[PDB]
Design an enzyme around this catalytic site. Structure first.
Site: not given
Ligand SMILES: CC(C)N1CCC[C@H]1C(=O)N1CCC(n2cnc3cnc4[nH]ccc4c32)CC1
Ligand SMILES: CC(C)N1CCC[C@H]1C(=O)N1CCC(n2cnc3cnc4[nH]ccc4c32)CC1
Lengths: 294, 280
Positions: A31-32, A143
């Site tokens: 969650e962002g 961030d």
């Molecule tokens: C932005 C901050 C406030 N949040 C707190 C929780 C993780 C972080 C997030 O939302 N993200 C987006 C999804 C991400 N992600 C995790 N495994 C992934 C695997 N592949 C991905 N491709 C683009 C994003 C992404 C992945 C981690 C960071």
């Protein structure tokens, strides 16, 4: 005469255009601020053989998500997550490549045996290169934390979320923050906490904190929040941030991670000079780590 | 017979008068004859840990004797203890002023300001810092008299200030920069809070002109955990609450002397008394 119809032009396929009807939700990835990322299989053949993708959707803030899409679409760096396309409904979704190993926050606690100091310093160089690429395009990340850094392989990391990324106006040095209620305060430089001003040097401070996380293998009990809360006290509520600013003003900083050599800690301390102008640059950090690596 | 000893069995709860930090105050009738003829009293008891803090407040109030300080009446002992005070039916200035604007003119507002300063100066001379001076803590004895009515955060100064540890429920919009930045509370910090209390009095405690509503309009109301640092930044820049409507510049200038950034540059309570007396 007969009823008329429009001459159908040659229907061209755009590989960056993903149809909503084929985007099949699997699980949440994080969650962002304005959005949320989900793991989906884009399955146009409907037989569970389609490619897996990371899909960012809004949780009002369509203009912000559209701006993040346009930033990511134009970033091309091996340590920056790849843009794949969009899904248009006025609504829009951002399509990115999916990295199965997830974030360093998830990966490091499960792979301590596999990742030694040398590999941690290589990740640190890669994060610095991706961040320097961003800075050279006049963007501030705002961030930078281990939870936003993805693991491509055991040998490669990529910056993986750009939800707070802002352009610095040409001939100006910082972006003035307005929306700050959900700020990752424990990763923030004093100028961010006191004056709501975000510089490239402020991203360097956040990198220092990210480096501390990498070195502690992202263990929750040694997290920057847990350590700062132990230093300042965890029962201050609305007074937490001013107590954090006061501790930083006094010269107090996160301690040397266990097993971290002084030469690595000294580079980390250069990210944490009180004044932005006295902080090390990403290029100086790359040189420093490269010297320790060979 | 101890006239300051109140038996629990004769205290009849009527209604709440206000919630404090560690305690709450209730209107009670102390009725030993059981025929509803007993005297009405204000009773402070712990919110259902902090008995030591309530005992300290009781001992402070028991030894304060000033016409602009609410009177201690006694205690009710169970380890447990309750603080017994005189009851002021007109309640606080926060409740009284909006209902009595027609009756209270500038001259009467300046007399209340002198009375608050005298009570506060008496407190300061006993080496105490109040830490919660606001219109909601000032009681109306009559149309001509006010009394400081709660001492829940009152601390003895050892040294020039008290170092604050418990601060999560701090009345931030009444607080001086040194309180917000370094958690240090001086007598000069009570002077800053008086300046804000004076602004409340002059605006007749209207909720839409309250120090919180005005500061939130200045700094923005959507900052959450960043509110206090944004408040500190605005104060550092020299920004202050504006002159209340119909307030003469000479009254506002005395108010501004309470708000010098540095505690040492602020007016004293004795200087404020002289200033108001000159205007009266
Ligand atoms: C932005 C901050 C406030 N949040 C707190 C929780 C993780 C972080 C997030 O939302 N993200 C987006 C999804 C991400 N992600 C995790 N495994 C992934 C695997 N592949 C991905 N491709 C683009 C994003 C992404 C992945 C981690 C960071
Ligand atoms: C201490 C602050 C945080 N709280 C917020 C609500 C009012 C205030 C309070 O608890 N009090 C105690 C009760 C007081 N009170 C109101 N009417 C009263 C009438 N008589 C009283 N005698 C002693 C106190 C007292 C009265 C007003 C202030």
């Amino acid at each position: 005469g007969d009823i008329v119809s429009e001459k159908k032009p040659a229907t061209e396929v755009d590989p960056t255009h993903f149809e909503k009807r084929f985007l099949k939700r699997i699980r949440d990835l994080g969650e962002g601020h304005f959005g949320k990322v989900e793991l989906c299989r884009y399955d146009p053949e409907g037989d569970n053989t389609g490619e897996q993708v990371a899909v960012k959707s809004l949780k009002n803030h369509i203009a912000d998500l559209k701006k993040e899409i346009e930033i990511l679409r134009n970033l091309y760096h091996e340590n920056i997550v790849k843009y794949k396309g969009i899904c248009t409904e006025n609504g829009i979704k951002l399509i990115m490549e999916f990295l199965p190993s997830g974030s360093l926050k998830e990966y490091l606690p499960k792979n301590k045996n596999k990742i030694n100091l040398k590999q941690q310093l290589k990740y640190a160089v890669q994060i610095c290169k991706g961040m320097d690429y961003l800075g050279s395009r006049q963007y501030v990340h705002r961030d930078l934390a281990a939870r936003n850094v993805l693991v491509e392989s055991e040998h490669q990391v990529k910056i993986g979320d750009f939800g707070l990324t802002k352009a610095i106006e040409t001939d100006k040095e910082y972006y003035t923050v307005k929306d700050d209620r959900d700020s990752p305060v424990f990763w923030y430089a004093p100028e961010c906490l006191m004056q709501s001003k975000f510089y490239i040097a402020s991203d360097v401070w956040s990198f220092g904190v990210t480096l501390h996380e990498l070195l502690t293998y992202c263990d929750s009990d040694s997290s920057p929040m847990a350590l700062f809360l132990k230093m300042i006290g965890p029962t201050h509520g609305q007074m937490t941030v001013t107590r954090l600013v006061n501790t930083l003003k006094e010269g107090k900083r996160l301690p040397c991670p266990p097993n971290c050599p002084d030469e690595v800690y000294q580079l980390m301390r250069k990210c944490w000079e009180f004044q932005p102008s006295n902080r090390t640059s990403f290029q100086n950090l790359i040189e420093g780590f490269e010297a320790l690596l060979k």
